[PDB]
Amino acid sequence: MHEIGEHLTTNTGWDIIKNRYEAAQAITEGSNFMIGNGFMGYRGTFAEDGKDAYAACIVTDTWDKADGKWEELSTVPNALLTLLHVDGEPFIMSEEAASFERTLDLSQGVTSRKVSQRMKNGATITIHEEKFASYRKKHAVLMKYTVESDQDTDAVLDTGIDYDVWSINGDHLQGHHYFSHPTGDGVTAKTVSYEDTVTVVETCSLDADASEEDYQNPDGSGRTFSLSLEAGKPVTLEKAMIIYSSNDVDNPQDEALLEAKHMQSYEEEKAANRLEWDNLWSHYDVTIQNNIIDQVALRFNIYHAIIATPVHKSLPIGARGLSCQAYQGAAFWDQEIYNMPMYLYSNPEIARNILKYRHRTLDGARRKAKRLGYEGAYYAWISGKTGDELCPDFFFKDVLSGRDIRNHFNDWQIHISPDIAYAVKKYHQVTGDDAFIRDYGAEMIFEIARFLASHAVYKPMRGRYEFMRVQGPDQYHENVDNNAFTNHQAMFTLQAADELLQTLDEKTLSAVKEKIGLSDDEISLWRDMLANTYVPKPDKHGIIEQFDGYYDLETIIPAKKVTERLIKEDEYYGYPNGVTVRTQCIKQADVIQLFVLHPHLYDRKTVELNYEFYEPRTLHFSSLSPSSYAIVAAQIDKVEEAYRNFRKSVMIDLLNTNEAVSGGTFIGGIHTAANGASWQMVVNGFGGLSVHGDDIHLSPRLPDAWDGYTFKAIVKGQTLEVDVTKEQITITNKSEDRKPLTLHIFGEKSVLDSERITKSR
Amino acid sequence: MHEIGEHLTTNTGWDIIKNRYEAAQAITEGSNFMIGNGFMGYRGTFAEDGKDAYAACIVTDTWDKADGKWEELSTVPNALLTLLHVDGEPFIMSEEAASFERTLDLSQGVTSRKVSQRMKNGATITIHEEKFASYRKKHAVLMKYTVESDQDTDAVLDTGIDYDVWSINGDHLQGHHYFSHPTGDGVTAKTVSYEDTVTVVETCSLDADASEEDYQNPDGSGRTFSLSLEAGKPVTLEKAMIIYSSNDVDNPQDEALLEAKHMQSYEEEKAANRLEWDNLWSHYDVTIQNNIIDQVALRFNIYHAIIATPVHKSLPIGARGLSCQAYQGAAFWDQEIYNMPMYLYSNPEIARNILKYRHRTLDGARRKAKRLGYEGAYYAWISGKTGDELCPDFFFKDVLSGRDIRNHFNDWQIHISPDIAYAVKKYHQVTGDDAFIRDYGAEMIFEIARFLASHAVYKPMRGRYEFMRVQGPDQYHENVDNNAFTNHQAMFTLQAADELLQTLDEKTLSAVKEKIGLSDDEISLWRDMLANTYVPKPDKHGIIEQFDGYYDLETIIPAKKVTERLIKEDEYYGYPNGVTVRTQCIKQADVIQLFVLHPHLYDRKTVELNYEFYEPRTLHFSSLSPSSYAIVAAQIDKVEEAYRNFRKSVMIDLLNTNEAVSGGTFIGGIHTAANGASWQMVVNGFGGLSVHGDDIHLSPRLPDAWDGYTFKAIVKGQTLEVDVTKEQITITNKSEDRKPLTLHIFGEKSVLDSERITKSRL
Ligand SMILES: OC[C@H]1CNC[C@@H](O)[C@@H]1O
Numbered sequence A: 001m002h003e004i005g006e007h008l009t010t011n012t013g014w015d016i017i018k019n020r021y022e023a024a025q026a027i028t029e030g031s032n033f034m035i036g037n038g039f040m041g042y043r044g045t046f047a048e049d050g051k052d053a054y055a056a057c058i059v060t061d062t063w064d065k066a067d068g069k070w071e072e073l074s075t076v077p078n079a080l081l082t083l084l085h086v087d088g089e090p091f092i093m094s095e096e097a098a099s100f101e102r103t104l105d106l107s108q109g110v111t112s113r114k115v116s117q118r119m120k121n122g123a124t125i126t127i128h129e130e131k132f133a134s135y136r137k138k139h140a141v142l143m144k145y146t147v148e149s150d151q152d153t154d155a156v157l158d159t160g161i162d163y164d165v166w167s168i169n170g171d172h173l174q175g176h177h178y179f180s181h182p183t184g185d186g187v188t189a190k191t192v193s194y195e196d197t198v199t200v201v202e203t204c205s206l207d208a209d210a211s212e213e214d215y216q217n218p219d220g221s222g223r224t225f226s227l228s229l230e231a232g233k234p235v236t237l238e239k240a241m242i243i244y245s246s247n248d249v250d251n252p253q254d255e256a257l258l259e260a261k262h263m264q265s266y267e268e269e270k271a272a273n274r275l276e277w278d279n280l281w282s283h284y285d286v287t288i289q290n291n292i293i294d295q296v297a298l299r300f301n302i303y304h305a306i307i308a309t310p311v312h313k314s315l316p317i318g319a320r321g322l323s324c325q326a327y328q329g330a331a332f333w334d335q336e337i338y339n340m341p342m343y344l345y346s347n348p349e350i351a352r353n354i355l356k357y358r359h360r361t362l363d364g365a366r367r368k369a370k371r372l373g374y375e376g377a378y379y380a381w382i383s384g385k386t387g388d389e390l391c392p393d394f395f396f397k398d399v400l401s402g403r404d405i406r407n408h409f410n411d412w413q414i415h416i417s418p419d420i421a422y423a424v425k426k427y428h429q430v431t432g433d434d435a436f437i438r439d440y441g442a443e444m445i446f447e448i449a450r451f452l453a454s455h456a457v458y459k460p461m462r463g464r465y466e467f468m469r470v471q472g473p474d475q476y477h478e479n480v481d482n483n484a485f486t487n488h489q490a491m492f493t494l495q496a497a498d499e500l501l502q503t504l505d506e507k508t509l510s511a512v513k514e515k516i517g518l519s520d521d522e523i524s525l526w527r528d529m530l531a532n533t534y535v536p537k538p539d540k541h542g543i544i545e546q547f548d549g550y551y552d553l554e555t556i557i558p559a560k561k562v563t564e565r566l567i568k569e570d571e572y573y574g575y576p577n578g579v580t581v582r583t584q585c586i587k588q589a590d591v592i593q594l595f596v597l598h599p600h601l602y603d604r605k606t607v608e609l610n611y612e613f614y615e616p617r618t619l620h621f622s623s624l625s626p627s628s629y630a631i632v633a634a635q636i637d638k639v640e641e642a643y644r645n646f647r648k649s650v651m652i653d654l655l656n657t658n659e660a661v662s663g664g665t666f667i668g669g670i671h672t673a674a675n676g677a678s679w680q681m682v683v684n685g686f687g688g689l690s691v692h693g694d695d696i697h698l699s700p701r702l703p704d705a706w707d708g709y710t711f712k713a714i715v716k717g718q719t720l721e722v723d724v725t726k727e728q729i730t731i732t733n734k735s736e737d738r739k740p741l742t743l744h745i746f747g748e749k750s751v752l753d754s755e756r757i758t759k760s761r
Numbered sequence B: 001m002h003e004i005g006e007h008l009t010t011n012t013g014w015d016i017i018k019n020r021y022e023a024a025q026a027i028t029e030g031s032n033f034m035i036g037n038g039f040m041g042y043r044g045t046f047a048e049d050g051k052d053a054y055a056a057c058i059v060t061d062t063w064d065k066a067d068g069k070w071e072e073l074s075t076v077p078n079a080l081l082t083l084l085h086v087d088g089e090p091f092i093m094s095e096e097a098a099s100f101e102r103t104l105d106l107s108q109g110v111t112s113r114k115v116s117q118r119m120k121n122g123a124t125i126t127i128h129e130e131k132f133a134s135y136r137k138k139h140a141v142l143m144k145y146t147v148e149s150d151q152d153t154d155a156v157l158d159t160g161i162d163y164d165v166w167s168i169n170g171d172h173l174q175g176h177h178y179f180s181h182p183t184g185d186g187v188t189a190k191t192v193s194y195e196d197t198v199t200v201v202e203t204c205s206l207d208a209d210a211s212e213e214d215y216q217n218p219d220g221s222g223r224t225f226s227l228s229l230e231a232g233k234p235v236t237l238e239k240a241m242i243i244y245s246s247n248d249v250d251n252p253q254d255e256a257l258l259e260a261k262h263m264q265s266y267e268e269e270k271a272a273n274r275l276e277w278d279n280l281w282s283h284y285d286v287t288i289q290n291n292i293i294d295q296v297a298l299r300f301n302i303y304h305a306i307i308a309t310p311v312h313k314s315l316p317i318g319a320r321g322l323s324c325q326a327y328q329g330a331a332f333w334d335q336e337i338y339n340m341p342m343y344l345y346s347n348p349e350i351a352r353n354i355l356k357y358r359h360r361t362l363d364g365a366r367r368k369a370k371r372l373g374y375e376g377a378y379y380a381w382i383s384g385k386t387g388d389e390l391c392p393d394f395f396f397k398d399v400l401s402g403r404d405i406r407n408h409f410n411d412w413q414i415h416i417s418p419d420i421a422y423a424v425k426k427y428h429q430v431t432g433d434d435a436f437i438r439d440y441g442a443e444m445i446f447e448i449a450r451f452l453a454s455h456a457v458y459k460p461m462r463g464r465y466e467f468m469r470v471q472g473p474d475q476y477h478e479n480v481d482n483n484a485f486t487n488h489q490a491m492f493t494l495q496a497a498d499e500l501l502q503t504l505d506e507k508t509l510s511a512v513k514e515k516i517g518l519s520d521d522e523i524s525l526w527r528d529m530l531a532n533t534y535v536p537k538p539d540k541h542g543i544i545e546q547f548d549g550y551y552d553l554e555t556i557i558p559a560k561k562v563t564e565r566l567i568k569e570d571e572y573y574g575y576p577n578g579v580t581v582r583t584q585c586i587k588q589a590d591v592i593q594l595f596v597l598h599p600h601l602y603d604r605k606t607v608e609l610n611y612e613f614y615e616p617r618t619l620h621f622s623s624l625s626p627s628s629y630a631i632v633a634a635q636i637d638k639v640e641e642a643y644r645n646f647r648k649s650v651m652i653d654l655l656n657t658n659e660a661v662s663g664g665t666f667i668g669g670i671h672t673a674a675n676g677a678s679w680q681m682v683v684n685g686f687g688g689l690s691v692h693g694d695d696i697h698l699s700p701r702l703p704d705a706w707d708g709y710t711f712k713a714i715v716k717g718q719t720l721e722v723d724v725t726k727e728q729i730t731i732t733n734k735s736e737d738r739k740p741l742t743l744h745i746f747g748e749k750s751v752l753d754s755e756r757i758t759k760s761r762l
C-alpha cells in the first residue's frame, strides 16, 4: 500500500517518495529528505539550489559564535552546486513540471530526484540526481547527476563550490582561499570566533566532451561545461564534496586532498556505503507487521536518529541533529532520555560513548555550577564541545514589544544533571558494565549528587530539604518549587550515589573520592537528604502535583483553548507572561515523564489517574510530548490512545505538523528526540520492555492497526529477539553463548533457560 | 511671602491659596484641598460638583469588594451638593471668571472657595463657601455656603444628597432607602460584599425667606429653595453631612439622627473644631524660621498626615489616606516606617495605638503566613480591617498588551513583618513603655521572628542561613536574594526576640510562650540564625550590595536615562520585563533605607560612600524616596543636597509632581508616607534626633535656606523643645515633672537636668 499523506508515498516500506514539487515546503523537505552520517548533514535540496532554497551542509565540531550570542555549527561551502542552462534558459523547478518525483531511500541514506520539464526551445529535459553522505568515508558526500534531452540542443552545465550559503546566525567562515587540484576546486577558510580551519574539496568528473572554462570570484568557484546534447544521449556528472577542519586533524587541507586522491567511483563509494547501512539496520530495524505506513514512518525516524549521531569522535547528538543550525548541534537532556535508549539496547557501546561524552565535558558542568554559586556538576542545558553552557540568557523575544525576555532554561532547569546520572545508572543496570562505572560513572554520579546537595534548601521548621525555584520538563512554568519530576530524579541520583558508596571496592572508592575531594561531611549530608527530602507523592485523588501551587493555577480543558488568548501566533507561550503562565496548561509530559523513567515506582491505578488528570491539560506543543504520553497510555490499558500518540510522534516531520518559529527564534529542523523516541514507543511502550532490578520486564500490548511487531534488545550481553502478535509473545535468545535469564511477563516470572519461550497475549 | 508655585500662594504660612480655577487639575486640587478628621475624607471640591469633578466622601471602616478584585473603602452619598440658578441659568465655574480663589486653612482644616461671575441677565453673583470635617464630631462634615447678587433677581438654590458618586472599583453601596426628618433628608444603604449598613444624614438651614419644594429620585433627593435675591443682601445656607455605618455603632440610622438633632450652628461647630486644631497643632507644629514657603509646605504635609490618621477606632492609616479610594484606605509598611515617627515623638499614645492595630490584626498575619506555607506572622502587604491580605496577585497590567502581570508585592515583599517588629522595639526604646511589651509587643515580635525562621533557608554546604526570593523596598526588583535591608531587618528582629527571652519576667514570658505555643526548638533555631545568617556587609569599596548579583546588572547613571527605552510612558517599570529589571536603576531608597532605620549601625564614611554610589542609581519614582535620601544626606555633611530632597518631598502634592496612573492602575491621591516623612526630615534628619539604647542623640544641621527651626520631641516621658539657629542649640525641658536625661550632641556628653541649656552649634 502506499499513501502516507500529503502527496507522500512508500513503495517498499524502505523509501519515502514525494511526487509533487512545492516551493513553499522547501525547508521541511530539505530536512525530511536530507542525508548524513554523524559527521555532517547535507539538506535534501536539488543540485541547483543555494541559500534561497535553504541548501546547507552542516558540519560537526565547527562551532562558531560570529553574532556574539548564538554558538552554533558552521555551514560550509557547497561543492555540489550544479546549474543547467538549455539554449541559455535556466533549468528551474516549476510546480507545473511535466514530471517530478523525489525519493529518500531509508535503506541506505540515498536521496534522489527524477524530473522532466519542457524548455522554451521545445526540448524536454530530464534530470536524474542522487546523493549520499558516505557512512564509510565520513568526510565525503557524493553526487551522481544525469541530464538528458529529447532534442538536440545547446546546453551549459555549470558546477562548482558556492561560498554564499545559508547561515542562521551570521556567516561563520571568513578569508576564503581558492585553490585547484587535478580533479577540481578547493577552498580553505577560517572560522570567525576561534579561527579554526575549514577546507572543502570538490571533485568533478564529466563523461562527455565539452568546452570547459574555470572561474573564481568572491562568492564561489567552478567551471562551465558547454555542450550540445544529442537527443536521447545522457550526460553524467559525478562529484564528491569532502570536508575537514582543524578540529578533526592537524592539516585539514592536505587530509582533504589526500581523501580526494583515494576516492573511488560513485558506484564503488555507494556500494561501500550500502554495506555500512546493511550493518546499521541489522542493529536497529524494528518491524511492524501489516502496516506499511507505520513501518516506513518508524524507519524514517530511526534513520534520522542515526545520521544525527556522531560516532567518529566524542561529540553531542544535536536536538535538531545536523539538519540545519537550529539548536546549535548540541546535546540537550533529549540526548540521554530520548536518544540513548535505542543504542543502550541495540548497540550498547554507543550508549557508553554518549555517557563518555558527558564524562569528557564534566569540567564544563563544573564551571557552570561554580559560576552560579553551586558545587559539583550542573550540566549545561545546551552542551557543545566542552560542556560550557551554550544556552543564552535571552533565548526568545516578547514579539508584542520587541524586547528580549529572560527565560531560565540555562540556570533553573536543573533536572539535566540527575537526568544524566539516571542514564549512567540505567546504562549499568542494563549492560552490567562495572568498568564503566569504576572509571567514569561513579565520578559523574558523585559530582551530580554534590550539585543536588548544593542546590537544595533545608527548611528547619519543616525538617526537610526542598528544591526551590526550578523549571521542570514543562518548559512553560519557571520559578516553581518541588517539581515532582526533579525531586524524584534528585532522589534517584542520591540513592545511586549511596549504593555506589556501599557497593564499590575500596580502591575504586578511594581513587574517586580523592579525585573530586569527596568528604565524609558531604556523604552524611547526602544520606540525611536521602531520608529527609520532600518528594511530591500521590494525594487523596491519587494525583501527583506537578509543582507546589500547580493546583492553584487556572484549569483550562482542553488545554488548547488557551490559544484563544494569544495576540500574535508566534508569541512565546511561557514565562514570564505568556498565556499559559497562570494556567495549568503544560507544554509536554512532566509528571507523566516521571512514569516513563521509573515505570515500576507507582501502581498502575495511580499512573492511570495521573494520565487522566494531566493529558487534557497538556498542549503537546513540544515534539517530545506525544511519545511520552504514548509510552504510558500503552501500559495502562489505553492502547488505542497510545497508538494515536504514536501516530502523532512519528509524523511530526513527515507531515510537517509543528511550527518553525517562536518568540522570534527559529526552532525548526528535524526533531531528533522524537526521532529517537519512535523506537522506544514500540519497544518500551507497546512492548513494555524495562529493566527493574536485575529483573527484566515485558508487557506486550498491540494496537488494532498492527498484526505484530518484532524487535531486538540486548540485556547484560544477551541479545533477545521479541516477537509479538495478537495472541502471543515469543522471546528468543540469539547470543553466541546463552546464559539463562528470568523474565517478568505481565508481572509473572518465567525462566528463559533454553533458547526460546512462547506465552499467550 | 506669597509664591509656592503654579498659581499658589501663602499669606500667613498657615494657608494655601490658589487663584486660578483649573478644570484639568481636578484630581490634584480635590486631594490637596481636602478636609478630614481620620474618620472620613471629603475632597476639596465645590458644592455644585459631582462624579465628573471627582467629588467624593471616603469613609473609614466601609471596606467593600464589589468588583471581585479590589477591596477598598466606600464613597458615600454626598449630602452637600448645591446648585445655584439665577433667573433660570445654572451657575457653573468658567476658567475665565471675574475672580476666583480657593484657600485651604491648615490651622483648622477649613477649605474654602470665593468666586464671582457675571450671569446672562447681567447679575454678578458671588459665592463664598467653606467646609470642615469636624474634629470634635467625627461623623460630621459641615458647610457654609453664601450667595450674593449685585442685582435683584430670581434665583434657585437646589440642595440635597447625591447618590451617584465617584467610585474607582465599582458601586459599593446598594438598596439606597430614602427617608425624611425635620431638618432635611437621609439615605440608608447596604454595602455589596459584607452587607454593612451605611447611613448619611443631611441637615440643612437657610437664613432667607424662600419657597421650598422636596424631590426624591433614584439618583438622590433634595429641595429647591426659590428666592428673590436683593442687590447686596447675602443669603446663607448651612449644612451638615453625617455618616455612620454598622461597623461603628449597632444602629447607624438612629445614631446619625441623634447627631443631627444635637448639631449646633455652623459657627459653633467651627469654634469647637478650631479648639481641637489648637490642641493638634500644639502637639505637631514644627517652626521654620524666615522661610514661609518651607514653613507652609511642612504644615501642609503634617496637616495631611493628621487628617489621614484614625484616632476614633483601631483602624489603619491609609497610604493615600482618605483622599480617594487609591491604595484601599489601608496600612502599608508606610504606616510604621513613614507615619509613626511623628506620633512616637509628639503624641506616643497614637504610636502605641498604631502598634495595637498591628497586634489586633495578628490573626490576619497568621492566616497569610499559613496560606503561603509559612508559620507565625506574615503581615499583609495591604492591611484593612482584619489583617488579611488585600493586595491582589495582579496589581498592574502590561499596557503594551492589556494582559495582567503578576507582581509579588503580596507574597515576596517580606520586610513588612520585621519592619513592624522594628517599630515595636523603637517604640519600646523611646517611651520605656514596658507594659505594652509585656501585653502586646512581645507576642508580635515572637510571631514575626517565627515567620522569618520559616521563611529562611539553610544552605548546608555554605553552613549559613539566607533569605531567598524576596522583594526589597526598591519595588522594581523581584525574586532577589539576600536583600541587605531585609536580612538586616530580620537580624534586628531575631535580636529583639532574644533580648525579650532574656529580660522579661518569668510570669509574662510563660503566658506569651504558652499563648503562641513557642517551643524551645524554635528558640535555639533563632539563636542559631543569629550567629549564622548571611548578612550583606560593606565590601572592599565600602559598598553594601543591595541584593545578590545587583552588581552584575546594567549601570545606568543617571538612572533616569533608562526611561528612553519606554515604549509607552505609563508602562510599569519593574517586574517582570520592565525597563529597570536588568539594570541597577532602583525605584527608591533600599540600602539607604537601612541607614534611615539604623543610623548608628555603620560609620559615617561607609554611609557616605553608599550614598554616593546609590543616589545616582535612584529614579526616586516613589514618593517614599526623597525623604529617605534627605535624612541620610543631612547627617553625612550633604546638607544642601538634603535640603533639595526636602524640597522635592514636601512639594510632591502641592506642585503635583507625580503621575496618578501606572500600568493601568490608579495610584494617585495624597501621598501619606511623604506627608509623615516631612516631619522626620526636619526632626530626625536636619535635627539628627535619635535614640540609641538609653542614649538620646542630636546633631543639628541647618540648611542655608532657613534661619532656624524649632520642634518638640518626647523621650521617655520628657517633653523637649529643641531650637536651632545658625550658632546655637537650645534645649528646654517642658515637662510637668522633669527627670534628668543624658543627651549626646554631635556625639558628646551633656546631662540635661534643669529647665534649659544652650550649647554652641559651631
Ligand atoms: O505607598 C505604599 C507603597 C507604594 N509602593 C512602594 C512601597 O514602598 C509603598 O509602601
Ligand SMILES: [Ca+2]
Pocket (backbone or CB within 6 Å): A615, A616
Ligand atoms: Ca488530548
Ligand SMILES: [Ca+2]
Pocket (backbone or CB within 6 Å): B615, B616
Ligand atoms: Ca540625583
